[PDB]
User: Fold this.
Amino acid sequence: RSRKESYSVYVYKVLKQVHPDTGISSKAMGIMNSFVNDIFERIAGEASRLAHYNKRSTITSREIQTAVRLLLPGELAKHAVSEGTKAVTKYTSS
Amino acid sequence: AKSRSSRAGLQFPVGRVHRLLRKGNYAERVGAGAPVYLAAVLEYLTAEILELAGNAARDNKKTRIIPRHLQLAIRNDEELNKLLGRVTIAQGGVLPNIQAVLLPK
Amino acid sequence: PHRYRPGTVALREIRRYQKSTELLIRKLPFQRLVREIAQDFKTDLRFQSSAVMALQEACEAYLVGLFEDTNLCAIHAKRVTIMPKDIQLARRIRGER
Amino acid sequence: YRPGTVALREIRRYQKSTELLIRKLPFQRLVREIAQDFKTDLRFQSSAVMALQEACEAYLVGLFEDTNLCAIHAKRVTIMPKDIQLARRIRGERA
Amino acid sequence: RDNIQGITKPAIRRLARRGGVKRISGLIYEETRGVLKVFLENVIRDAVTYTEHAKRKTVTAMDVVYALKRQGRTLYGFGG
Amino acid sequence: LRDNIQGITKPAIRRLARRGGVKRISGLIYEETRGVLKVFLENVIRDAVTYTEHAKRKTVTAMDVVYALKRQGRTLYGFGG
Amino acid sequence: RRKGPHCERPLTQEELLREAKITEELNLRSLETYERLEADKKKQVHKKRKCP
DNA sequence: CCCGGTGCCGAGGCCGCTCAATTGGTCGTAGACAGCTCTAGCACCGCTTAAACGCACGTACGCGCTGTCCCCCGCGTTTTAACCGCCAAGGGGATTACTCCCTAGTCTCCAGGCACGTGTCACATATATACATCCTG
DNA sequence: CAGGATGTATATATGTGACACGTGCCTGGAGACTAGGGAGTAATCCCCTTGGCGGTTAAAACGCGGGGGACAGCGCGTACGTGCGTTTAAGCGGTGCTAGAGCTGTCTACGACCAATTGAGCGGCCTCGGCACCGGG
Assistant:
């Protein structure tokens, strides 16, 4: 067989973190994986476009931040930016 | 020894995200913090949607997120709706809503 | 005998099918139509069982949205009933025409 | 003149030219107003402002072209607010 | 062949119910059939264009998803 | 600035409607058009300022507006060099 | 935590039930004999004429 | 629509292997930052005046009502096929062998992209009668 | 069934904006010429997932009847258009000033890159329990 791959494990872990007792079916898990892949594709494309605009040959955390700003509507953008910045700050300290 | 996900405090695979970014032709140089940031944003969105769908399925006496309630959450949340506007969730159905003009009385 | 007034069973059907999540188009006729359409694009092409289901899902979602916009356009004209002109206006505003 | 003749004349006149229909000096001030809510002391290029005005005019022309059909759908000649509202709703801006 | 009539009046009526309509005209079915036929034709054309380049004898749900994404009707549930 | 949305007057909106084909216009159509134009400019200029701030620039260039319009779906030619 | 189920009518009497079914035997035999006789006396398999 | 019983297959947890993520180590290059500048964005003020604002008047369009005629809607019975299981075999995918195509590097060289000045070369603005093209009689 | 009375073309003209055309620069490109890499084409071949047989009831379909909804006619009212007069700030282009986008020059930390090691993830398998199904209230 091949090795199709998905974020199922991490989706299940986040599902347990948010609702410790509420499970999820296989169809729902696949839909969530597809959503994650589509959001990844969109954010990465926007970051690459920002890099090409700024003539930067690299996609940095700032590019990802601006791509998230250019896509998420308002409060969602403000929360995702805070999450990303906190994650990067905690990563830089280890 | 230590996965970058646990290092940054995230559950998503920072390493897999970095690999996909550097292999997806997005750029010639992936920053050290770019994949961490992207994984953090993805985890935030996933947690939002999972929590909403969980408490939408548990609102119907169930204990397992299904596509119907996933769609219900995505279409009831004004932010997630603008995000996934032109997206269609398979087996998600539609929101219960009958126009007042069609309604009797 | 006993029969409901016009407008009582339509609302029941709406309230039922708006909560039920299942393909409304008939599976085998839709598959035959997909095969017919693909025949005019390439001869002797096979289709995976899941491809036809995905096509049916997408077409049903598109038609549901189209009928929503059609009902909106019909109510805009003070008409509780929809008609092909409503679909025409819906598509015109959507930009499909 | 009969109500409507001088209006069809203006229709045929403005569907023939291509100049900007919104006044520059008033539209640039609106652009700077909307930019103030995002960044203080923000500079704008003349080309950028002209592109913004062109985009706005094209969007409004399309919106009024859809509103005309929305009004005609109700056997009405005058466009009412519900017409633009239906246009926006079916476009997906305020659904 | 001409099996476009497989999308029958009751199916179109149930689709209308799901879309929230409570009353259909007599000439709506022949218009919905043509609209659905055009939408299909387009999506299937894109899918077959993907399959030809893929060199696969079987059209795949992945090709269908790619066609839907090209047409702007992104669909979740079939691996994309 | 303030209340510059009123810089889009009734003659300007009526010319914009004439160019769109409308023959007769109502009274509240002008307010509706002002509100819609303001909502559109809000998003366009938000995208433009997002493209600008990220570039550490103090001037909103025309390419920023072009990219904002592309994001919003309104691809605009004539200002891309 | 507002509503709740209910149930009642827990009654089944062995001997009285035996009597009740021994009585229902009468109705069963009546139905069988009635069906048999009615069929035999009414059907008498045959056909009818046309209505032109 | 809600409630108690049964039931089953799909959800979720365990096993095990491997391949991607990680750790360690190097080069270099795009970038961060400071230095300089010169364009363009900003501010201002006056002469000109075209467009905007306010108001009057009535005419035609919204809109409300009524009436007919029918074209869908609900219900009953009648006819078609969608749907749920078996059985070949036709393809979608693993496995191995091998070559045309592209990568990388380094000179050699045709080509286009402006700085500048010069010479043509549109059609915007202006002017007028000719033509509709009305609308009140 | 006209005619003032407007408005809308149609044609002509000219001179100032702008295409249009040399004149040499050169530096970023464009291609030619060796050497090295590499991934996908091609041929088998094992293995699931299609496409093809016969029944079962469930949904599609045909009809009927009357009922409520579409569409047309008509009229009341008012507001939206057009014209006139008053008012205002919009367009112009003339001058002054400096702010920072941009070019540039230098020094440097970060990431691609390469090799070895390790465990996170994923196919697979099995046991089990959340919800599908159902018949009475």
